[PDB]
Symmetry: D3
């Protein structure tokens, strides 16, 4: 039928950092969300690709994500390439996502911007019939950006107060990334990173009058219907 | 008991220009919307206070607005004054609006910014029990700005595609403002102004994938719940 | 002698959407303007490349454009490539345009930003003698951006009130793009798009005290001489 | 009959810093430019009202400005007051300027923003017939801001390459301001200030491909006609 | 003789929220920091002027602040008034601060912007000899803004990793503000506010590679000398 | 041991224009700074590559720069390429710079933005152990941008009042670039350019209360410790 949400990350844990709470919130309401990791994060200082993929599976189940893909594009190699756009178009056209999410570009990790750029190009081409005509076109309704590193004034927020614990659980599934363990090394991700993610969501929460909120960017104004006065 | 929306303008027609479509959309759904105009637009180039008051009633009727107030503050005199803030605080506390709207400040007409500034101060003070303790306090949930003159990248939009006709009717209620008539003088408001308002809403509409949308500003991030996936 | 204006678009109709009114205004005053379409818009949902080229010719004549080129670069393929910059440099050096226009980058169609980026690179290289020394260098005086999709606060406007009908005519020349016809499909361009373009120009018009104005972006402050107090 | 340009400053030398070059350029072409300083700069660290008034006359002469007014509002007292707005409205309606200039608000000296704010309110009210109905209204065509302290990405520039010398002469007319002399104290204005003003204009110049340019801000998009292709 | 830092707030706890960590960091190094609260927060939902004054003393003690003043201006009455500017000018000239801090204007509480605006006007006038000539003038070196409500991309940060505990202690001194207690009502300040303040500082910290950092705004570019390479 | 500062430019003279005063200020204090020019500026209208390299050496000695490298990437060819990132990573890992500087992207010369983009990518990859594992990783502490063409509100300034003459000397070392001579041609660099650079620094100086200051951009807030209240 088609995914309600397809969220792209450069590396498994990107989507979790940006929007694990939102995903958990909406999968619980019965919406179908998929995650597509562009790379296997082979250059990550800690862990292995297989371990990372296993953690991605654990995280997916925590978030109620039934569909998780890895396009196996090179870590630190998300250049603006036709072949990569093609691969993402294939994903978009296969899963027909109503909404697509990708990282926000203003991020210390260039892969995140590069992922967003590829996804943006792919979203546009996905709706073009004559492009890759072997697959039926799909028009994504909206493209939004979640935040990985740092913070920005969000265009919109999703209240994740009831789902923060699940987000932390989803994040903690990436043991290799955010914890040293027995043979791991100290990285920015190991040293108070998950705490920083919680902090951001607390900060965004306060902005909108809730305990924890995830913040999102949108190139277009968000369309309000039921959320203006509530009632759903 | 309280209004769902209270929309402030400096002059009658302000709220209409900014959000007649949204107001009509929501009153049709059974929501209670009030309008409070800060002034009687005593200095308007065309028309009189008399004619404007009647037009404001016609516009309110068109929009399904049952409550329209005018604070009769001086046109072009919306200075940051305690007396004016307290009058607006009285209004907010009386009508207990969930949402308050006011003009966006980036506007060629200084009254519009001045109105927004007064309303913002009043919203904050309205929630403060110790302030004007004779009148029970009220906490407004959200404060949004609509656009009168010009345009800005909206923080959010309301699809008014079905209500554009009603918006135009509500605007046209101000015949003294938007038409020269036979005795009136040419103003920015008579020279393709209503057409410009429709044009803006068309532009905002296209941006969000609808025919016509009204654009709004919000200092805080918009909180989505049902509107993310509909 | 050299073009007064060379306007680039990614697709034929880009320049029209952004600045058909301005072009018509200035060709009528006897200025020479050319248009260079980077692609043949082969991936356009409606029409054919030949039909599109014929519509581009009709549009050009409506606007009083005597020079129209198509570089036949791939639709959805305006990557930052040396070969493409080279081709545009060749165009700039051949036609010696005083002003160059291209799409503004803040646009839902990535080709538009990509076109602008290529043109910007080419403009700079066009003025470098040692670059492609087989063609004499040319220094473009100013590079401005017109708007295709959406809207932005313009850095400057051109009053096109007297030329709006001609702009609409130029736009309507692209029957395949903005009208369904007998065998066309519904796209964002077919559903109230031309009306939206008029709306934008009405909006920009009001900003500057005229009926219809086209809005432009400029990286540098515009230099005023005669337009400060008028009189020409 | 009306001025082509009326330039407001908070203090005499403001307009010179912002736009002496532009003023000189246009007065030489036969355009009528007036300057109105809101205050007599009564609190200036160096000089006196007496000396400053004379310097302002010398500067006006250098710039070819035939009309210079001073409203003698309080230095550091340019509050948003009705009385001050109406005094400025009187000036605008008397001199009927096509263009009005005032300082840009993003400036370390609060009087400059305060001046601009007052002037903006006055420009709007100047066009309103019912406001101060004893004096015929005037509609200003465009309102632009010049820069005094610091710098900003200009919305537009005026090539003043031929008039930099005149600008420097006009600035140097304020010897009490830009030089310590023999009894004066060190201020931001004495410590390489004129050199900084020239520096800015050099920077703006380079940006637009000329030797020296003055930079201006405009809330509305600049309307080009002849200057697109020259 | 003069203070190194004078930090202004509209209400006691403002300075703490913005910069208790920085203040503690620098007082521990032997720098003299003063705090001036413009109002006694007479309209605060919870507590009394009495309790708040005592809490402000406890907070000052925690931060190593030896000088705390209160100007007892009206809560929610921080209008741009000459009388208020001059009171603040008196404070600046008396205590001769090298640096002055005030709230950042982009803040849901209008008093915070209003405080900053008053302080900015006062800083400028404090340096003007002819203004209030009975009291020797003082030139403040730099004016910075700290953040109370919300967050902004800071122009600069101060590493407060070692002083977060002291900041929390200083905030917790305002038990009447940040806890409902047993008789108090729920406010934005009682609902995970201190946790939000810590959260912000964690966020700013991460941005600059430390555990906790306080963020500051500066209208002028930050001048680096020793901190470029440490 | 490792450089305190490594400054990248696209062309020799870039670093000088942006930060010759700062470099001179800090080399005089005994800090070690290196410069890496990405290209030999082979497309420069005046001079030759060898002459340019000789001027770069003269400029380096004026600034007290003991290390100057040229990566010999193509002028007007600083595309986002893996090979170029690799080369810069090698430089960063070899010289272990505490701070890295590159041009600010908002610049009429696209090479400057392109240089900054390459350097940003390289800085990130330089800290990744598994990337190019033959060289030990290096974490650059901070990345800042200097300004070449035009001007921007600086995030921070360095007082160069005492070192302006040295900056002018460093700039004047590029005789081929900023002076016509006997067989040179008129370019934007020859016509009041060095004067414009001084002007900018005078402008930035006034902003921070000094005679001359260089202005820098930083993606992160600058961390103040000693510079808040002085004393070092
Ligand atoms: Zn990642
Ligand atoms: Zn109005
Ligand atoms: Zn196109
Ligand atoms: Zn002044
Ligand atoms: Zn407060
Ligand atoms: Zn260069």
């Amino acid at each position: 039928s088609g995914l309600h949400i397809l969220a792209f990350g450069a590396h498994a844990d990107d989507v979790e950092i940006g929007m694990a709470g939102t995903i958990a919130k909406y999968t619980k309401q019965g919406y179908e969300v998929g995650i597509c990791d562009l790379t296997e994060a082979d250059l990550s200082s800690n862990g292995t690709i297989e371990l990372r993929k296993e953690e991605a599976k654990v995280a997916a189940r925590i978030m109620g994500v039934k569909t998780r893909l890895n396009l196996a594009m090179p870590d630190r190699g998300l250049y603006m390439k036709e072949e990569y756009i093609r691969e993402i178009v294939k994903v978009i056209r296969t899963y027909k996502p109503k909404l697509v999410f990708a990282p926000y570009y203003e991020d210390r990790h260039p892969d995140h911007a590069n992922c967003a750029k590829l996804v943006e190009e792919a979203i546009f081409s996905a709706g073009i019939r004559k492009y890759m005509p072997e697959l039926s076109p799909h028009r994504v309704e909206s493209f939004y950006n979640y935040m990985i590193n740092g913070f920005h004034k969000p265009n919109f927020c999703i209240d994740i107060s009831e789902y923060l614990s699940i987000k932390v659980e989803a994040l903690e599934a990436y043991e290799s990334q955010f914890s040293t363990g027995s043979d791991g090394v100290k990285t920015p991700l190991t040293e108070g990173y998950v705490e920083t993610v919680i902090a951001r969501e607390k900060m965004f929460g306060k902005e909108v009058g809730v305990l924890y909120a995830e913040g999102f960017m949108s190139k277009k104004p968000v369309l309000l219907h039921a959320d203006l006065l509530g009632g759903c």
